[PDB]
Amino acid sequence: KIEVKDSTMIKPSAETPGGSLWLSNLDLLSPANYHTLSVHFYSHDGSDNFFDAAGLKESLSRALVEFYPYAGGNRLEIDCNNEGLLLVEAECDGALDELGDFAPRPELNLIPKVDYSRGISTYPLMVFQLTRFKCGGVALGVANEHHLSDGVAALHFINTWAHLSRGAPAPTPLPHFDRSSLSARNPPQPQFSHAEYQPPPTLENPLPHTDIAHSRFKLTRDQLNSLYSTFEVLAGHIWRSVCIARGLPEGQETKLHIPFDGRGRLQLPPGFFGNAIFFATPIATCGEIESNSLNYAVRRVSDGVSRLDEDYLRSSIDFLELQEDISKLAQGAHSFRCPNLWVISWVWLPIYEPDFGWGKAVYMGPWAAPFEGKSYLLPNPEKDGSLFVSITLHKQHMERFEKLFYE
Numbered sequence: 569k570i571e572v573k574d575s576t577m578i579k580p581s582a583e584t585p586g587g588s589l590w591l592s593n594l595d596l597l598s599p600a601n602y603h604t605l606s607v608h609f610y611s612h613d614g615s616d617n618f619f620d621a622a623g624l625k626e627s628l629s630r631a632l633v634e635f636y637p638y639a640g641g642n643r644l645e646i647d648c649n650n651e652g653l654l655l656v657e658a659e660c661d662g663a664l665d666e667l668g669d670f671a672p673r674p675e676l677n678l679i680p681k682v683d684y685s686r687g688i689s690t691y692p693l694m695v696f697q698l699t700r701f702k703c704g705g706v707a708l709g710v711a712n713e714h715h716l717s718d719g720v721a722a723l724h725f726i727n728t729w730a731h732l733s734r735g736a737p738a739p740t741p742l743p744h745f746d747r748s749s750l751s752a753r754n755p756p757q758p759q760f761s762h763a764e765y766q767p768p769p770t771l772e773n774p775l776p777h778t779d780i781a782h783s784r785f786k787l788t789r790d791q792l793n794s795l796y797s798t799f800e801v802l803a804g805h806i807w808r809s810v811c812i813a814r815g816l817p818e819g820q821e822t823k824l825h826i827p828f829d830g831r832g833r834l835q836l837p838p839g840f841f842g843n844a845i846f847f848a849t850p851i852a853t854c855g856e857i858e859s860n861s862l863n864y865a866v867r868r869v870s871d872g873v874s875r876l877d878e879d880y881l882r883s884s885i886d887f888l889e890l891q892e893d894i895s896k897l898a899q900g901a902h903s904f905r906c907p908n909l910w911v912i913s914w915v916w917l918p919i920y921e922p923d924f925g926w927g928k929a930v931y932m933g934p935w936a937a938p939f940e941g942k943s944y945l946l947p948n949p950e951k952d953g954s955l956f957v958s959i960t961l962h963k964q965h966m967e968r969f970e971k972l973f974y975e
């Protein structure tokens with residue numbers, strides 16, 4: 569019940585010199601065809617001209633005068649050609665209050681499908697969706713190429729794109745586009761054995777069912793430790809709950825994958841624009857997860873995160889430097905599946921700070937993903953001090969997963 573209205577490609581207003589620049593080694597840790605995408609929801613207010621299209625286009629140009637690589641040898645890079653940034657405005661016969669709590673069920677008309685079979689550099693790298701409803705509310709669906717930038721950089725871009733629409737100046741440190749700070753050493757000397765690069769522990773006794781279910785949970789009972797970060801304890805609990813709810817045989821290896829922003833532990837320049845996301849991979853058998861205390865799992869995840877010191881991160885970069893190709897090491901879409909698990913945390917991220925001049929977001933959230941195996945941590949826009957756990961799991965296991973509440 570959604571249909572396209574307009575499809576535009578936006579140039580910057582200024583020149584923005586478009587010399588192609590170098591992608592990092594961590595940027596090459598994704599498939600050549602992948603968009604990470606989420607949606608921003610805005611409810612209508614008493615103000616006239618709620619998200620006018622022309623104002624947003626002439627604000628998008630004033631935003632692209634800084635972030636020009638969004639419009640644009642044997643190694644991946646797409647030149648800043650300044651030819652266009654896809655912006656498709658749609659129309660829906662819907663009421664935003666009928667959504668209720670925004671379960672991201674796969675009715676993907678809030679975003680478009682892209683085709684890079686015609687060319688990997690033919691179409692641009694990011695797409696925005698401005699879909700307007702019957703109630704006057706609007707959904708803004710963002711879809712970004714992971715090679716170009718991570719969630720932090722695209723979030724900073726959307727915050728600049730917010731401040732330059734509300735008549736305010738640029739948000740913080742202006743974006744830095746030279747990724748030479750994430751370059752390998754000279755010479756490259758790895759010093760550790762990296763399990764973030766070894767293949768995931770698949771090949772278990774096969775699964776009878778394949779259909780999955782998504783569930784988004786509220787947990788207002790964070791304020792208890794039954795003897796570490798909040799994230800480490802919570803991730804240990806989620807991981808133990810999943811490994812118990814799956815009923816896998818003891819001796820089956822499970823592997824938790826955790827994104828980790830390497831801007832702080834390393835010395836990255838401010839406004840660094842690109843992927844600075846490493847991986848924290850603690851491995852353990854499902855038995856010793858289910859047959860030991862929560863202390864075991866939380867210590868395992870804490871050792872998985874605390875290993876990522878400066879030496880280990882630079883050694884990982886040098887290990888990537890030693891490789892033939894790096895995109896052959898990028899696991900995904902099959903690493904996601906059981907017995908493996910992802911857990912992220914958007915609680916610390918400023919995902920609600922984008923205010924275009926019409927108010928804050930009622931709800932932003934992920935949409936349309938390779939679903940199973942990925943647990944997310946979100947903040948509640950009700951700001952009751954509560955926290956959301958958005959997980960996807962096979963149906964046989966989602967009902968078992970209710971022991972997350974059992975401390």
Ligand SMILES: O=C(/C=C/c1ccc(O)cc1)O[C@H](Cc1ccc(O)cc1)C(=O)O
Nearest residue numbers: 604606710718719720722723726827845912
């Ligand atoms: O969760 C985020 C969200 C990104 C985002 C934030 C705000 C926006 O407006 C738009 C996108 O990023 C991760 C990326 C990722 C995945 C696996 C890894 O091993 C390393 C990194 C993801 O989407 O899964």
